[PDB]
Design a protein around this ligand. Structure first.
Ligand SMILES: NC(=O)C1=CN([C@@H]2O[C@H](COP(=O)(O)OP(=O)(O)OC[C@H]3O[C@@H](n4cnc5c(N)ncnc54)[C@H](O)[C@@H]3O)[C@@H](O)[C@H]2O)C=CC1
Ligand SMILES: NC(=O)C1=CN([C@@H]2O[C@H](COP(=O)(O)OP(=O)(O)OC[C@H]3O[C@@H](n4cnc5c(N)ncnc54)[C@H](O)[C@@H]3O)[C@@H](O)[C@H]2O)C=CC1
Ligand SMILES: NC(=O)C1=CN([C@@H]2O[C@H](COP(=O)(O)OP(=O)(O)OC[C@H]3O[C@@H](n4cnc5c(N)ncnc54)[C@H](O)[C@@H]3O)[C@@H](O)[C@H]2O)C=CC1
Lengths: 426, 426, 142
């Protein structure tokens, strides 16, 4: 509260405005009182504008810091596990053994989805992108779970949330199986959250599948590292749709579509295919696949970052995890040595150095998932799946906040009142 | 500009911000660069922040004014038709006979949906709410229409717009047919937009259907009166989803759910149940929901509005059409004259005048709909079907602005960094 | 007396008693229980019938539906004037009724159908078909 006294605005008359500060991050000037005084600002993008108060996740992109409930991501990535991290994001505190047991038991008990929903997957085409099917099923949930749609009911929010945490991975693995023609696999209660997901993704009735504890921890880590990322395009969507009263399932569905968004962006789309194919230690290495950048599409391949200035804090543990997985799966990684090739170019190439296309958290998750035999199309599905807990938290905080349903202003510049005189005769 | 001359932001030095003027409405303060210098405004509920600049629709709350590309809603609803209004909202000017016939042809020849998309209907439960099915189906279209998901490819955007505009009526009709267990009706390239919808809604293979001209016109007007409504909640969901780059169908599915949202409260449809549930002057109204109403339970049955001060300009023509409909029908009106008592109560009950709970277009819209035999479980599906052209116009505009992404800032008031230690186990 | 049977015998032996007029020898009983146990699973085409019903339907109504539909699938034992038909039909009913019942239930709650297990008693098998899921092994409380 140093010089945080307060500031003033004026054009023909003056106004008082308080200076609010956060526990971390810069100060903000409250203008919640200017609307009434007849004063409005213009910020197409919400860059200069702060629209909410949160205590979920804290980010300082310049210093490469990411905290979830004060707890640093690196620690959580190595010291906790997805469910405990989930428990932390939604409850604001680490769990006691008892609270945790109860939490994990509630999740584990509702992993199986209604058989009528399963019947939905079968109406989709086999050739469809699993991310698209994922948005389809999740957006269809409200028709089957109409018993917990009222967000103004804390008991509904509770049930809906858990339904999502438990069922997302089940839905995800069904999107995959469906895309490769193998039978759906039921959740198993004796398996951890991650071990159960790998089993639903890979096992068949032909033989017993055994999850490699190493790959299981890696998957668990891929999840923790994608649970939440503070304010962003997809979290804003979840918040915006949420404050309109939209049911939780629909909210999570719009978040999933917002996450997928940049993928089918034409310029990005074209390039991503260029990577997911051109790689015969001829091209990629001799910057052959990198002698073609008319479109950047870098972060979509895991290069550079919007928030973080020099490195993706989440990428520290994923790289070491990445190293561990590769050594575990033995060295029959010919093509997947372009991974080592690209990292070298991202760091040593003057271009990448200058424009800072440094490997982010996805560059390594991508390498881990590939190493596991997971198709490229299932990447964002798994990220959206993990990001779900983060979306619930933001949604819960949004409502359980004050539900200040905002009815935004627009600066109009269209035609002035004019009379209509159709030129058609129908 | 009146008090909109020049303004200076004062901290410990002066920051002169300029005042922007709109062709109609309020002048705003330019603050696009403030954050660009560290200073962030704080405004939840967006009481002062102008979400964007738009040329589509103008609303003057206290003046009960509503314009679409400059034309008064009264003029359009009376001497225009839904398609022509679609053209104007989308193109910015009324069409020539040639532009209209070209636009109409395309709209009619894309009204049939892919057969597989029609299979997905049979996977939902027969007791599913029409609106939840409408959301589920819409949120699943991206899986099929993968050739039109590039939000940046103008050709993709055009196809996506025509696809949504053409098929929405087809799908809304099927949601009704599936709910009551009647076979689905195909589009009729020879019928008009509203007539085709009426045909798909009530025709059966058992006998040919007659499209009453007064009902045909009533419906088209309902479509016109709901074509668009400026920067509201559902549209903010669409603009924000589209900002991330989410595909056309995902954004509209988000809009639908968002438009349905303020109707999930167990007190909502509950009070909206006793309403239509009775056809007896002295049942629904004398001495009943005096307080029997719960959440909104006023504002849900077509009473009042948070944008307009004195009245809803859309109700004018809607109230006129209501008479024409109840008059024309006879059989489906008279025993439904508990409307006049509900309206009378609104125009004289001290409680209603005290809460400005005046009858809005949706009150008169419901009457026309209840008269035509449409169940209240279809009302918002129909309102959404019409609003889609609006969502499409705003989504496009947001794009034209440069795909204005919505990833705002937060005021972090949570835990400062704190070590993480887990003494438990999973 | 019913009190004795309720405490001293078991459903199948009681079934054997109602249809044969006498309590069973070990051999007669073994044969009886083996005949029942061997036909608990129903034709997969009948199972396809359950799925044409609405999920919201009363399980008693679905029960009357499937049982009244059996003659179309088991047209091989409809002539009551044939003692061999009566025999087969009867057993089909004793074995399949519980299977049909648990399918009506599962269908009403959205869980997958559970196949009969031969290692389980008539009642233990019914509880398992009513309650187990593929997610974990179900253990019937004796
Ligand atoms: N935290 C809480 O109190 C929660 C309570 N529920 C309640 O559970 C009931 C079922 O809800 P849904 O899970 O949405 O059912 P749903 O309609 O998807 O149907 C799934 C069925 O399979 C069962 N199931 C799912 N996973 C299972 C597993 N791993 N082991 C054994 N059974 C499993 C479910 O209990 C349900 O019977 C409802 O009453 C719901 O409100 C659901 C989530 C959380
Ligand atoms: N503005 C334009 O030129 C548009 C072109 N298209 C193109 O048309 C094809 C997709 O068309 P969709 O209708 O989305 O196919 P769809 O996947 O929805 O399947 C419907 C099929 O029946 C046809 N059809 C639809 N409505 C009809 C009607 N009322 N009468 C007779 N036939 C009808 C469609 O052309 C298509 O063959 C693609 O090539 C797409 O790019 C789609 C929309 C707009
Ligand atoms: N007491 C007797 O002699 C009886 C003879 N049958 C005969 O058995 C044959 C099949 O009749 P349904 O049972 O009505 O077949 P059905 O048409 O329902 O089809 C069921 C199929 O699954 C088999 N099955 C059922 N439960 C089984 C189990 N627990 N273990 C292994 N296999 C099982 C059946 O044998 C049959 O192959 C026919 O020839 C029928 O006449 C049936 C009942 C009694």
């Amino acid at each position: 509260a140093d010089t945080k006294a307060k500031l003033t605005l004026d054009g023909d008359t003056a106004v008082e405005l308080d200076v609010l500060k956060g526990t971390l991050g810069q100060d903000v000037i409250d203008i919640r009182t200017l609307g009434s005084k007849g004063v409005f600002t213009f910020d197409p993008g919400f860059t200069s504008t702060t629209s909410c108060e949160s205590k979920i996740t804290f980010i300082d992109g310049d210093e490469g810091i990411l905290l979830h409930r004060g707890f640093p991501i690196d620690q959580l990535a190595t010291d906790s596990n997805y469910l405990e991290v989930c428990y932390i994001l939604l409850n604001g505190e680490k769990p006691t053994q008892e609270q945790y047991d109860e939490f994990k038991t509630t999740v584990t008990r509702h992993t199986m989805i209604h058989e009528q929903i399963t019947r939905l997957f079968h109406a989709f085409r086999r050739d469809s992108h699993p991310m698209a099917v994922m948005c389809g099923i999740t957006g269809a949930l409200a028709a089957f779970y109409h018993d917990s749609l009222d967000v103004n009911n804390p008991r509904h929010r509770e049930i809906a949330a858990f339904r999502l945490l438990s069922k997302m991975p089940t839905m995800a693995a069904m999107c995959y199986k469906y895309s490769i023609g193998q039978p759906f696999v039921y959740p198993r209660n004796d398996l951890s959250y991650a071990g159960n997901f790998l089993n639903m993704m890979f096992s068949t009735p032909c033989e017993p599948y055994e999850v490699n504890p190493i790959l299981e921890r890696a998957m668990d880590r891929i999840l923790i590292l994608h649970a939440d990322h503070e304010q962003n395009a997809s979290t804003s969507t979840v918040r915006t749709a949420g404050s309109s009263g939209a049911n939780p399932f629909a909210c999570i569905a719009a978040g999933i579509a917002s996450l997928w968004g940049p993928a089918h962006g034409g310029a990005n789309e074209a390039a991503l295919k260029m990577l997911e194919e051109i790689g015969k230690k001829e091209n990629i290495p001799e910057f052959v696949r990198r002698a073609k950048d008319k479109n950047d599409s870098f972060r979509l391949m895991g290069f550079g970052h919007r928030v973080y200035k020099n490195y993706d804090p989440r990428a520290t543990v994923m790289r070491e995890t990445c190293h561990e997985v590769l050594k575990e799966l033995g060295t029959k990684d010919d093509l997947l040595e372009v991974a080592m090739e690209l990292e070298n170019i991202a760091l040593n190439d003057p271009y990448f150095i200058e424009k800072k296309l440094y490997p982010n958290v996805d560059f390594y998750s991508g390498i881990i998932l590939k190493a596991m035999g997971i198709p490229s199309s299932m990447f964002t599905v798994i990220f959206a799946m993990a990001r779900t807990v983060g979306w619930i938290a933001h949604w819960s905080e949004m409502h359980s906040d004050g539900m200040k349903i905002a009815r935004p202003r627009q600066l109009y510049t269209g035609y002035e009142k004019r009379d209509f005189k159709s030129d058609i005769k129908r």
